[PDB]
Design a protein around this ligand. Structure first.
Ligand SMILES: *[B@-]1(*)O[C@H](CC(=O)O)c2ccccc21
Length: 359
């Protein structure tokens, strides 16, 4: 005898709200979408010093969840005939022609299998010229295509190439093409002055206010900021790609296509994919040190799961993000915080909520 909106709010209170005190997190937004109905829950402060409450207008940094938009942009360019995933980067960034990195194809860049690209660019690589020199100086290590090492430079280069193929800077690919196509009106690579009042402070581990700093190829790797309503709309788009024009529908579907496996994890384009129902440990394994921080040999997909789910975590210095959706259950969840919390806690809390919501 309790309305569903209250049932979902109670589940989020039971599973996400305690994380605020446990990790001293100033502000949090959690959203659930089920059967095209959205439920938004806001807690705490987007700015401690300004006593400004988290609300539907609050803009949060998505960290690596930005890679889902980069992947969507690549799927869009591929389906418009602007790139093939079998192309190499020198076809588009001409200064890379006939360098060793020009042996790596675009899908391998997007899915982290070049064989010699680390988590981050070197600290000293900052300017556009330094980024170019870094890729010109790149040499192979492991055999191309065989080992996954999650990597910002890898998918960053993919995003730069996607942008070159579309004749626009990457920030404009998202702000002028991809965000409008997905119906997102409060999502940004660069937050404009007229929206800075809505941009949350992030909070470091000392609870000091901070925001993300510029970095090499930051936009395609971790450059997006968004609101809870926009992220629910993005989940809706992933749950209902048939509701978009052909090129955008196909772009979304590209991001859902698993490309290879590492144990129980399927690497799609940006998204991680799993057979559903997934055990909690399967989902935790995807964020283990072994999977995130080390190279792992990839295997071809054997079981192509008809019933599946997708997720991605992201963090910046001052923010945490988790997004997850389950197509055949018509459900998804978004968590945004303005302080990092352990990825396992995000995954566990979402798992508990999603499994307990009545169908
Ligand atoms: B991008 O995605 C992962 C998210 C995570 O496991 O916390 C990541 C970690 C470190 C840098 C960049 C990313």
């Amino acid at each position: 005898n309790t309305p569903k909106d209250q049932e979902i709010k109670k589940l989020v209170d039971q599973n996400f709200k305690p994380l605020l005190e446990k990790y001293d997190v100033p502000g949090m937004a959690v959203g659930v979408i089920q059967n095209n109905k959205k439920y938004e829950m806001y807690y705490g402060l987007q700015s401690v010093q300004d006593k400004k409450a988290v609300n539907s207008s609050t803009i949060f940094e998505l960290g690596s969840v930005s890679k889902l938009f980069t992947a969507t942009a690549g799927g869009y360019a591929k389906n418009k005939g602007k790139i093939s995933f079998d192309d190499t980067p020198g076809k588009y960034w001409k200064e890379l022609k006939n360098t060793p990195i020009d042996q790596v194809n675009l899908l391998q860049l997007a899915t982290y299998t070049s064989g010699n690209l680390a988590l981050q660019f070197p600290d000293e690589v900052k300017t556009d010229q330094q980024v170019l020199t870094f890729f010109k100086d790149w040499k192979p290590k492991n055999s191309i295509g065989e080992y996954r090492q999650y990597s910002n430079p890898s998918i960053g280069l993919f995003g730069k190439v996607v942008a070159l193929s579309m004749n626009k800077p990457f920030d404009q690919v998202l702000e002028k093409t991809i965000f409008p196509a997905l119906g997102l009106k409060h999502s940004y690579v660069n937050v404009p002055k007229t929206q800075m009042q809505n941009y949350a402070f992030g909070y470091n581990q000392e609870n000091q206010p901070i925001r993300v700093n510029p970095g090499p190829l930051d936009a395609p790797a971790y450059g997006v900021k968004s609101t809870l309503p926009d992220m629910l709309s993005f989940i809706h788009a992933n749950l209902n790609p048939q509701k978009y024009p052909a090129d955008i529908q196909r772009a979304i579907n590209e991001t859902h296509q698993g490309r290879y496996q590492v144990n129980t994890m399927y690497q799609a384009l940006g998204w991680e994919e799993f057979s559903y129902p997934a055990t909690l440990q399967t989902l935790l394994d995807s964020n283990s040190e072994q999977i995130v921080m080390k190279p792992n040999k990839v295997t071809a997909i054997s079981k192509e799961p008809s019933v599946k789910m997708y997720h991605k975590t992201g963090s910046t210095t001052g923010f945490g993000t988790y997004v997850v959706f389950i197509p055949k259950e018509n459900i998804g969840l978004v968590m945004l915080t303005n302080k990092r919390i352990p990825n396992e806690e995000r995954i566990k809390a979402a798992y508990a909520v999603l499994n307990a919501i009545k169908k």
